[PDB]
RNA sequence: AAGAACCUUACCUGGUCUUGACAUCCACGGAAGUUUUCAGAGAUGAGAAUGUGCCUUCGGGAACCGUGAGACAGGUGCUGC
RNA sequence: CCGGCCGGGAACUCAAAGGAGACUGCCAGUGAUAAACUGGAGGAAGGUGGGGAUGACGUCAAGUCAUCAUGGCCCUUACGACCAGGGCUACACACGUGCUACAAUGGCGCAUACAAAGAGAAGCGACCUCGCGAGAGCAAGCGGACCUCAUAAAGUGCGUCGUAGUCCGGAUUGGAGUCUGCAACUCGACUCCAUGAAGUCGGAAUCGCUAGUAAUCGUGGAUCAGAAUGCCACGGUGAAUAC
C-alpha cells in the first residue's frame, strides 16, 4: 500500500486538482470534528474545507 | 484621542491571548475539582490582564466603547459611514 | 398540630399554618405534603398523631422554628457589640441585599414620610 | 442633518458596491480593516493623482484593487514603478498577494469625488467659493449631465458666522431611487476652520 | 380528482384528505375526541370547516401544517373551496357570493423603532 | 451564593496571616483587598479593611468566618 | 455525489456562478441535478444614526447571504482538470464536499 | 450606554515622567523572547537561567527590546454661540 | 420500526430566482361634454391593498469639541500615564417609562396540542447517568433548511380551590448550583424554603390605539465570561365604536 502511514501536517500538492502552486499554513486541526480541517485554497479561494484521507487521494 | 485605552486594550489582548489562554485554561480545569487550593493560588499569581474578562471589545478606527459591533469590527458611526459609502460588502438598508 | 408556634390547622391545610410559623420555609410544607400524599383540604377532625410526629421530626431535622429572630438578633447584636457596620446597616433597615432604595423598598421603609 | 446618503439608498438598486468580497463572521472585520488600511494609504498617498473610486475585490486568497482615476499616468508612474511599489505595499498591508488595475475616469468633472476635491483644493488655495461652485455647475452643464447640486458649508471667506451656500443647476432628483446620482464629499482644512464640500451629479434614470 | 388540502391563512397550509364518507375528524392518526373534541372554540373553528357545505357526506382527516388554529381552519376552508372549483365550476359563484373564496390577507404588523409594538407608542409626558 | 470548589483567600493575605500567627507579635495588618473569606487561622488578629484615607480595624472572631472581609467595613457615609 | 455549496452576497453573482458550474457539468456530459436554493441569511443590524442622543430615530441594515447547492450526480476527471479558476468571481465563496 | 464586580472608568491612595501609556527620529548596547525567586496593594523594582539563530555589496541589515538629552508627545481639558 | 423511514415520485406545503396580476382596467349613476366621487361585475387582493425605507427651502445660534476630525485657549516632573480599592448601585420625599397584581373570564394539580424569527466555532450543545432544583460529568451532531440552542405560551379535557390577602407576590443573614477567578461584602441572577407587606380595580387629572390594530398570550436576537421587566424582531387568539 502506497503511503499507508498517515502523518498529520504532511503537505501534499495535487497537480490535477485546483490546489496546484498554492501554499498554506495549517494552524489548527480539528480532531474533535474527526475530519481534517485545513483552510484550503481552491479555485484561488481559501476556505476551511473538511477532508479525509479516503476523501482526497494523497499526492 | 484615548491612546491610553488603545494601548491598555492592546495590553490585555496580548496578555490574554498570547502569554496565556493555555496556562489559564489548564489552571481553570485544575481548579474545578475532578475525582488554599494550588490552582486558585496560581491563577491569582498570574497577572489579572490575562483574563478574557478584561477585554472591552472596542472600535478599530476610532475607539468608541459603545456601539461596537463584533461582526463589522468598528463603532456604530463608522459602520454607518462605510455602509453609506459602500466599503462594507452587502450592507443595504432594511425596510421590511 | 401546634409545635413551637402560634398557628394551628383548622379544617384547612397544615402547610399554611406551618409556613406562617417563622423559622422555616415552604420546602418543609412541600415535604410534609409529599410524606402525607393525601388531600389536606379535608376537615382537621381526627388529626393524626402520625402527622404530628412527622411534622415534629421534620422541623427538628431541618432548621427548627424560632431561628429567624435568633439569626437577625445575633447578626445585629454581634456587629453592634464589635462596633462594625454590617449589623448597624441591618438596624438602619434599608436594603443591603443589593436592592435599590432611591424611591423603591417601601416595604422596608413603610409608609412614605414627607 | 436630515438627508439620506444617496449611495446608501441606491446601493442595491442602481449604484454598485465599492468593495466586493465574501468573508465569514470571523474574517469580515479583519478584511474590512485591511481594506481600510489599503484605501487610507492609497488615498493619502495619491490624493495628488486625483483618484475617484477604489474598488477592492478579494477572492479570499489574493487582493485585486482597481483605482478609478482621471490621470492614469501619475498613478502608474514611469514603467509601472510607482504602481509596483504600490502593489508591494498593498501586499504587505493586506498580508496576501496583491494586484492593481487602473481603470480610467473619463470626464473628470462629472465625477463627484473629483469635483469635491477640486473645490477643496481651490478653497485651500483661497479661491472664492462662489467662483468654485459656478465653475463646477457650469462645467457639468456643458459636459452633459442632467443636473448638479454643489453645497459648500461653513466658515466661507473667513467669516466668524458659518453659513451653508448651495448652488444648483438642472435636475437633481434625490428621492427617486431609479436615478443615478454619484454623491461625494471633500474636506478642506483651512486656517480659520474646515470647509466641507458636498456635490451631487445627476446623470440619468436607470 | 382527489379532494385535497389547498390554500393558506395566517401562517398555515392545509393538508386534508377529504373524501366521501362519514365525517369524523382524525388528526395525526388520532381522534378529535382525544385531541380537543370537547374543547370550546373547536366548534367555531369547525364551523368554517363546514361552511363550504360540502362536508355533509365527506370524511375528514385533517393534518393542516403550520400556524394557529383559526388560520388552520381558514386554510382547510379555502382548500375545500379551491378543490370544489377543481371539481365543478358552477358553485364558484355561490362561494364568491357567500365570501369564502377570498383569502384574508390580514397579518401581523411589524415592530417599529422608538415604539413598544406595531403602533403602540410610549406614554407621553406633556411636561 | 458563591463557589464550593474552593474557599477563596488572597495569597498575600494568606502569607501575612500565617506569618502573623507564627510570630505571635504583630500590629494591624493593612490590606486593600477586601474580598477574602476569613479562615479560622485569622481569629486572634485585627485585619484592616480599606475605607477612605481613614482606618477601619476589624478584630475577627469565631463567628465571622464564612463572611468576606468587607462586610463589616462601611464604604459610604450617611446621617 | 460532488457536493458544492456556493455562497455570496448577491444573487446575480450566485446565478452566474451556479450556471457556470451547471455549464461545466453539461460540457462534460453528465446527469445534473438542478441547483437548489437554500434559505437566505438575513443578518440584521440596527445602528444608531445620531452621535450623541436618539432612541426613536435609528436605521437598520441587512447583510443577505445567499446559498445554492448544485449536488451534481457524476464528477469526472475532465471537470477536475477544468476546475482551475473556473468560478472567477470575487463575490462568491464556494464550499466543497465529497 | 447595543452590558457599572475589576475592565470599562475620568472623581480618593501609592508608585513615573525629557521620553512618558501612546508614534517619529539622533546616539549607544542587547536577538526577539521563554522560565523562576524575593519585597510590595500593585504596571514597580531588585535579582537568576536559556536563546548571540533571522544575516549584512558584514565598512553589518532585521520586525524588535533597554537607556539618554532635545525636538516631540499626550489631554474623555474649555469654547457646538 | 407505521417515524417518510424507504424505494420511488415530483403532485402539493415549502425554500428561492424570473414573470403575471391591480391599472379606475370595464359597466351604471352623479359631476361640465373634465377631474373625480358613489356603487357593481370579474378577482386572492379595489381604488395610496397593508406596513416600511424615503424627512423639501428652512427653523430652534437645539445636540455632540465624550465618536472622530478641527480653529482658538490652557495644562505639559501634570489637566499626561499605571495599580489596588471605591463611586456611577446611596436615600426625607416628588413625578416620567415599564413590569407583578389586587383573582373565580382566575389560580393549583394530571394529560394533550398548534408557530415564526434568529444565532452558533474559546461558539451551540443533544442521548445517558447523578441530583427536588439551578446544574454536574460523559458527551454525538455541527461554520448550518441536517445538528444544537428549543417536547413554545395563552387554548384546552377532567378535578380541586367557592373571600383568599390567593402561587398576586413583596422581605436582612442564611441552604445552595452556576458565571470569572482581580473577585458575587459595598455589587449578578437562578427552584432560591427563608417570616407572604401592600393593593378588595384606584381623586384631580393624564396617556396609547379605526382591524389583525387595541387588549392579552408566549419566543428569539444585539451588548456580552455572566448580568433585563429596557431596547431590537417574531409568532397566537382577537375586540368594541365612529351619529
Contacts (Cβ under 8 Å, ≥6 apart) of B86: D7, D8, D11, D15, D16, D17, D18, D19
Over its C-alpha atoms, chain B yields an Rg (Å, rounded) of 19
Contacts of residue D62, defined as CB under 8 A and 6 or more positions apart, other chains included, come to A44, D96, D97, D98, D99
- For B28, phi then psi, to 5°, come to -70, -45
Give strand pairing partners of D205: D179
Q: What's the CA gap between E14 and E77, in Å, rounded?
A: 9
- Distance between the alpha carbon (CA) of B76 and the C1' atom of H41, Å: 38
Cα within 13 Å of Cα(F48), Cβ side: 14
Q: Which residue in C97, C94, C90 sits closest to C73, CA to CA?
A: C90
Residue E108 forms contact with G (CB below 8 Å) = no
User: Cα dist. B52→B67, C21, D74 in Å?
Assistant: 20, 48, 48
Backbone angles phi, psi at G7, to 5 degrees: -135, 140
What Å value separates CA B45 and C1' H46?
A: 19
Beta carbons of D68 and D101 less than 8 angstroms apart: no
For domain D16-106, give the CATH number: 3.30.300.20
Mutate to test the interface with D, among G5, G90, G95 (most CBs of D within 10 A): G90
CA distance G92 to G80: 19
Indicate the resolution in Å: 3.2
Find the helix or strand (DSSP H, E) in which D204 lies.
strand D194-205
Residues in chain C, how many? 114
Number of H helices, E strands in chain B: 4, 1
Q: How many residues in chain B?
A: 96
- Which CATH superfamily includes the segment(s) D107-206? Ribosomal protein S3, C-terminal domain (3.30.1140.32)
Q: Could you write out the DSSP letters of every residue in C52-89? A: HHHHHHHHHHSSPTTHHHHHHHHHHHHHHHHT-HHHHH
Dihedral sign of CA atoms E113, E117, E120, E126 in order: negative
Query: Cβ of E125 < 7 Å from strand I?
Result: yes
Helices (H), B1-96: 3-17, 23-31, 38-45, 76-85
Per-residue cell: B49: 490582564
- Round to the nearest angstrom and report the end-to-end CA distance of chain E: 69
C77 touches chain F (CB under 8 A): no
- Check F11 against B31: CB less than 8 A apart: no
Three-point CA angle F64, F67, F68, nearest 5°: 120
Which ranges in A1-59 belong to alpha helices (H)? none
- Angle, helices D81-94/D28-45, rounded to nearest 10 degrees: 150
CB C17 within 8 A of CB C7: yes
- The angle at the Cα of D70, spanning D64 to D73, to the nearest 5 degrees, equals 75
* Rounded Cα distance, E74 and E76, in Å: 5
The CA distances from residue F47 to C87, D118, F68, in Å, are 18, 72, 12
Q: How far apart are CA D86 and CA G69, in angstroms?
A: 39
Q: CA distances (Å), B42 to each of A35, B23, B49, F57, in order?
A: 36, 10, 14, 29
F26: CB within 7 A of chain I nucleic strand: no
- Do residues A50 and G97 lie in contact, with contact meaning Cβ atoms separated by under 8 Å? yes
Q: Which of E12, E10, E39, E6 is nearest to E25 (CA)?
A: E39
Which grid cell sits at F72? 463589616
- Where do runs of H (alpha helix) occur along chain G? 11-28, 77-82
| B23 CB-to-strand I distance under 7 Å | no
CA–CA distances in Å: residue C55 to residues C23, C52, D47, E10, G88: 14, 5, 88, 56, 80
Residues 6+ apart with CB under 8 A from D75: D46, D49, D51, D67, D69, D82, D83, D102
Distance from CA of G63 to the nearest CA of E (A): 19
Give residues with Cβ within 8 angstroms of G49, minimum separation 6: B80, G57, G58, G59
How far, in Å, CA of D61 to CA of A44, rounded?
6
Domain G1-98 has CATH 3.30.70.600: yes
Which of D60, D41, D61, D59 has its CA nearest to residue D51? Answer: D41
C-alpha cell at E89: 365550476
Measured CA to CA, the distance from residue F29 to residue F36 in angstroms comes to: 14
Domain edges within chain D? 16-106, 107-206
Pick the closest to residue D184 from D130, D118, D122, D127 (CA basis).
D118
C81 touches chain F (CB under 8 A): no
Q: Judge if the beta carbon of B94 is closer than 7 A to nucleic acid strand H.
A: no
Closest CA to D22 of B69, B59, B88, G62: B88
Cell of D12: 442595491
User: DSSP class of residue B32?
Assistant: S
β strands within D15-174, DSSP E? 19-21, 51-58, 64-69, 100-104, 147-153, 164-170
**What radius of gyration, in Å, describes the C-alpha atoms of chain F?**
13
Q: What are the Cα distances from residue D46, in Å, to C14, D49, E49?
A: 88, 5, 73
* Long-range contacts of residues E93-102, Cβ cutoff 8 Å, at least 24 apart: E95/E52, E98/E51, E100/E51, E100/E52
Map out the domains of chain G as residue ranges.
Answer: 1-98
Amino acid at each position: 500500500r502506497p503511503k499507508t502511514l498517515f502523518e498529520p501536517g504532511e503537505m501534499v500538492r495535487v497537480n490535477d486538482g485546483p490546489f496546484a502552486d498554492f501554499n498554506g499554513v495549517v494552524e489548527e486541526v480539528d480532531y474533535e470534528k474527526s475530519r481534517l480541517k485545513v483552510s484550503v485554497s481552491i479555485f484561488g479561494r481559501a476556505t476551511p474545507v473538511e477532508l479525509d484521507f479516503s476523501q482526497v487521494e494523497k499526492a | 484621542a484615548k491612546q491610553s485605552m488603545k494601548a491598555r486594550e492592546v495590553k490585555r489582548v496580548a496578555l490574554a491571548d498570547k502569554y496565556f489562554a493555555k496556562r489559564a485554561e489548564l489552571k481553570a480545569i485544575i481548579s474545578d475539582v475532578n475525582a488554599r487550593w494550588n490552582a486558585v493560588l496560581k491563577l491569582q499569581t498570574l497577572p489579572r490582564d490575562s483574563s478574557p474578562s478584561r477585554q472591552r471589545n472596542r472600535c478599530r478606527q476610532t475607539g468608541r466603547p459603545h456601539g461596537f459591533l463584533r461582526k463589522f469590527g468598528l463603532s456604530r458611526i463608522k459602520v454607518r459611514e462605510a455602509a453609506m459609502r459602500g466599503e462594507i460588502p452587502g450592507l443595504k438598508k432594511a425596510s421590511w | 398540630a401546634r409545635i413551637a408556634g402560634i398557628n394551628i390547622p383548622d379544617h384547612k391545610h397544615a402547610v399554611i399554618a406551618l409556613t406562617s410559623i417563622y423559622g422555616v420555609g415552604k420546602t418543609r410544607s412541600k415535604a410534609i405534603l409529599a410524606a402525607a400524599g393525601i388531600a389536606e383540604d379535608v376537615k382537621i377532625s381526627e388529626l393524626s398523631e402520625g402527622q404530628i410526629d412527622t411534622l415534629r421530626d421534620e422541623v427538628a431535622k431541618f432548621v427548627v422554628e424560632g431561628d429567624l429572630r435568633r439569626e437577625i438578633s445575633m447578626s445585629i447584636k454581634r456587629l453592634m457589640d464589635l462596633g462594625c457596620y454590617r449589623g448597624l446597616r441591618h438596624r438602619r433597615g434599608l436594603p443591603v441585599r443589593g436592592q435599590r432604595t432611591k424611591t423603591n423598598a417601601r416595604t422596608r421603609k413603610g409608609p412614605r414620610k414627607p | 442633518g436630515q438627508k439620506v446618503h444617496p449611495n446608501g439608498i441606491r446601493l442595491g438598486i442602481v449604484k454598485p458596491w465599492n468593495s466586493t468580497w465574501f468573508a465569514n463572521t470571523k474574517e469580515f472585520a479583519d478584511n474590512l480593516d485591511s481594506d481600510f488600511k489599503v484605501r487610507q494609504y492609497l488615498t493619502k498617498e495619491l490624493a495628488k493623482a486625483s483618484v475617484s473610486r477604489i474598488v477592492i475585490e478579494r477572492p479570499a486568497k489574493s487582493i485585486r484593487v482597481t483605482i478609478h482615476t482621471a490621470r492614469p499616468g501619475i498613478v502608474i508612474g514611469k514603467k509601472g514603478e510607482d504602481v509596483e511599489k504600490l502593489r508591494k505595499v498593498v501586499a504587505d498591508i493586506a498580508g496576501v498577494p496583491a494586484q492593481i488595475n487602473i481603470a480610467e475616469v473619463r470626464k473628470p468633472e462629472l465625477d463627484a469625488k473629483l469635483v469635491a476635491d477640486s473645490i477643496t483644493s481651490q478653497l485651500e488655495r483661497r479661491v472664492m467659493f462662489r467662483r468654485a461652485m459656478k465653475r463646477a455647475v457650469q462645467n457639468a452643464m456643458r459636459l452633459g449631465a442632467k443636473g448638479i447640486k454643489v453645497e459648500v458649508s461653513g466658515r466661507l471667506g473667513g467669516a466668524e458666522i458659518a453659513r451653508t451656500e448651495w448652488y444648483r443647476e438642472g435636475r437633481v432628483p434625490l428621492h427617486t431611487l431609479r436615478a443615478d446620482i454619484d454623491y461625494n464629499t471633500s474636506e478642506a482644512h483651512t486656517t480659520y476652520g474646515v470647509i466641507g464640500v458636498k456635490v451631487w451629479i445627476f446623470k440619468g434614470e436607470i | 380528482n382527489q379532494y385535497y388540502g389547498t390554500g393558506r391563512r395566517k401562517s398555515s397550509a392545509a393538508r386534508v384528505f377529504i373524501k366521501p364518507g362519514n365525517g369524523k375528524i382524525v388528526i395525526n392518526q388520532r381522534s378529535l375526541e382525544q385531541y380537543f373534541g370537547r374543547e370550546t372554540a373547536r366548534m367555531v373553528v369547525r364551523q368554517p370547516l363546514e361552511l363550504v357545505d360540502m362536508v355533509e357526506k365527506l370524511d375528514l382527516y385533517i393534518t393542516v401544517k403550520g400556524g394557529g388554529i383559526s388560520g388552520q381552519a381558514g386554510a382547510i376552508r379555502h382548500g375545500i373551496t379551491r378543490a370544489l372549483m377543481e371539481y365543478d365550476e358552477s358553485l364558484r359563484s355561490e362561494l364568491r357570493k357567500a365570501g369564502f373564496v377570498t383569502r384574508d390577507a390580514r397579518q401581523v404588523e411589524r415592530k417599529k423603532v422608538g415604539l413598544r409594538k406595531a403602533r403602540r407608542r410610549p406614554q407621553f409626558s406633556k411636561r | 451564593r458563591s463557589l464550593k470548589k474552593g474557599p477563596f483567600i488572597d495569597l498575600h493575605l494568606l502569607k501575612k496571616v500565617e506569618k502573623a500567627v507564627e510570630s505571635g507579635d504583630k500590629k494591624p495588618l493593612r490590606t486593600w483587598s477586601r474580598r477574602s473569606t476569613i479562615f479560622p487561622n485569622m481569629i486572634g488578629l485585627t485585619i484592616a479593611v480599606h475605607n477612605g484615607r481613614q482606618h477601619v480595624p476589624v478584630f475577627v472572631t469565631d463567628e465571622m468566618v464564612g463572611h468576606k472581609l468587607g462586610e463589616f467595613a462601611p464604604t459610604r457615609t450617611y446621617r | 455525489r460532488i457536493r458544492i455549496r456556493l455562497k455570496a452576497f448577491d444573487h446575480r453573482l450566485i446565478d452566474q456562478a451556479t450556471a457556470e458550474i451547471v455549464e461545466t457539468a453539461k460540457r462534460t456530459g453528465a446527469q445534473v441535478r438542478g441547483p437548489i436554493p437554500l434559505p437566505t441569511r438575513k443578518e440584521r443590524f440596527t445602528v444608531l444614526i445620531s452621535p450623541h442622543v436618539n432612541k426613536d430615530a435609528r436605521d437598520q441594515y441587512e447583510i443577505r447571504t445567499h446559498l445554492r447547492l448544485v449536488d451534481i450526480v457524476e464528477p469526472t476527471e475532465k471537470t477536475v482538470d477544468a476546475l482551475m479558476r473556473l468560478d472567477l468571481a470575487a463575490g462568491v465563496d464556494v464550499q466543497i464536499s465529497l
